[PDB]
Design a binder for this molecule. Sequence first.
Ligand SMILES: Cc1c(O)cccc1C(=O)N[C@@H](CSc1ccccc1)[C@H](O)CN1C[C@H]2CCCC[C@H]2C[C@H]1C(=O)NC(C)(C)C
Lengths: 99, 99
Amino acid sequence: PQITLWQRPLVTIKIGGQLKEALLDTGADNTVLEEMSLPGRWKPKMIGGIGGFIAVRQYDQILIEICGHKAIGTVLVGPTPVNIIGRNLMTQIGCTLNF
Amino acid sequence: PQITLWQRPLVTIKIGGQLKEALLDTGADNTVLEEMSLPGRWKPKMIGGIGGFIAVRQYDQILIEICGHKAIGTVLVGPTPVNIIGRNLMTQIGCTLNF
Ligand SMILES: Cc1c(O)cccc1C(=O)N[C@@H](CSc1ccccc1)[C@H](O)CN1C[C@H]2CCCC[C@H]2C[C@H]1C(=O)NC(C)(C)C
């Protein structure tokens, strides 16, 4: 799959038995999902974007299926308006920028 | 150029006679630079990221040289902590995501 950038690079994910849409985001160090319940224990974390900071819950070794490719990594959960797949997960699916 | 995502995808830009480093950001609709003086007249704009909103100045038809590729487009100027090259400029340089 080659994805051009004329539209947002949204992909379908499967995480915790749920189907979501998420944005492939090269400008994000981390992966950030809207509120959802996840197994097992987490740690509080602040992350900064443009315009300020949000509080999130850090879950490690969480299974995610991104466009049919499985990856396990750290997933942050909190009040983001868009599901974000960051570089931590993108490297696991062999995802590159090209030009 | 193929860019893997193990590190931030930072590139050198030239804009308004100045050299800067900027992040190639698939998760950004717009291009956002820290405070700098630019030719032309501008319009006020609010943009939202994670954790809130910032006020920026919208400059159109601005020349930018991104990793040696010229592009002209809308550049937003304001209190972003990182220079961000968004999709609007990335399409102009033939930039794709691949995996
Ligand atoms: C800059 C920009 C636009 O011009 C237009 C639309 C969105 C954005 C925007 O802020 N996008 C961001 C993701 S968050 C997001 C929020 C709303 C919609 C889509 C994505 C960037 O892609 C990533 N963004 C780039 C960059 C922005 C300036 C501050 C430092 C980083 C923070 C980083 C980021 O947010 N990282 C998290 C791990 C917290 C997710």
